[PDB]
Amino acid sequence: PDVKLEKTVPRLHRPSLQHFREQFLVPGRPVILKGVADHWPCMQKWSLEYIQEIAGCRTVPVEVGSRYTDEEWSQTLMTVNEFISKYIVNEPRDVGYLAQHQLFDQIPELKQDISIPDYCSLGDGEEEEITINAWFGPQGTISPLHQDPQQNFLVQVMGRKYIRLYSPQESGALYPHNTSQVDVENPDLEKFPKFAKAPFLSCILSPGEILFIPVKYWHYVRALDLSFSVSFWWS
């Protein structure tokens, strides 16, 4: 998608903690951190076949469908192997996603391949209550526009994701059902008049990069290739 024609998220190579707290965290402004996670072992070490070997056997919850309404999506328990088989390799017809699952409690060994970003300590909370999630799905997975109740560090390990960001002081034009009723990349201009002209920031997130997504900031995600991401929810 055309990102050179959109306002893009600012990228910074290893900004100091102070400059992050003051210019981003406190005011709640997105930023892309560069050269912080890119040498994490996960970056080299996590091929499709690496994961398939070590995790292939474990049972994991799988999203079929997109999350616009509760009734509009469903989950299924299968193995990583069944999942990789049915929704990734060869020619998968339907989409399925391994979203928002805590793989690193299920498999503490993988914890050595990632770190907790230093920037987290600027928050009030304790490292132990930080919620790490895995997001592992094929190209074409869509997580609809919504906001989380915490600060977020989303780390991209494998593949690229297109991400769009609307601030919270912009909720009006987004039409909450929280989560939006708008389809960011195919919007009903008339059902939703106020949306076309709401200001956003966007980005293509690549391997090695971290997107800071400020608490309650609205975000929408579409994967551009086979993808693996790790999120840190923190306060």
Ligand X SMILES: O=C(O)CNC(=O)C(=O)O
162 counts as binding ligand X under rule CB under 6 A: no
66 counts as binding Ni ion under rule CB under 5 A: no
- Contact between 217 and 147 under an 8 Å Cβ cutoff? The reply is yes
Per-residue burial over 73-84, b if 16 or more Cβ lie within 10 Å, else e, is eeeeebebeebb
Those residues whose C-beta lies under 8 Å from the C-beta of residue 98, and which sit 6 or more positions away, are: 60, 61, 62, 63, 83, 134, 135, 136, 137
| Burial of 54 (C-beta count, 10 Å sphere; 0-12/13-18/19+) | middle
| Cβ proximity to ligand X, 22 vs 232, nearer residue | 232
148 is in an annotated binding site: yes
143 counts as binding ligand X under rule CB under 6 A: yes
Contact of residue 221 among Ni ion, ligand X, none (CB under 5-8 Å per partner type):
ligand X
154 counts as binding ligand X under rule CB under 6 A: yes
229 counts as binding ligand X under rule CB under 6 A: yes
What is the closest distance, in whole angstroms, from the C-beta atom of residue 118 to Ni ion in the complex?
Answer: 22
Per-residue contact track with Ni ion, 121 to 150, x per CB under 5 A?
---------------------------x--
**Interface residue list for ligand X (CB under 6 A):** 135, 143, 148, 152, 154, 219, 221, 229, 231
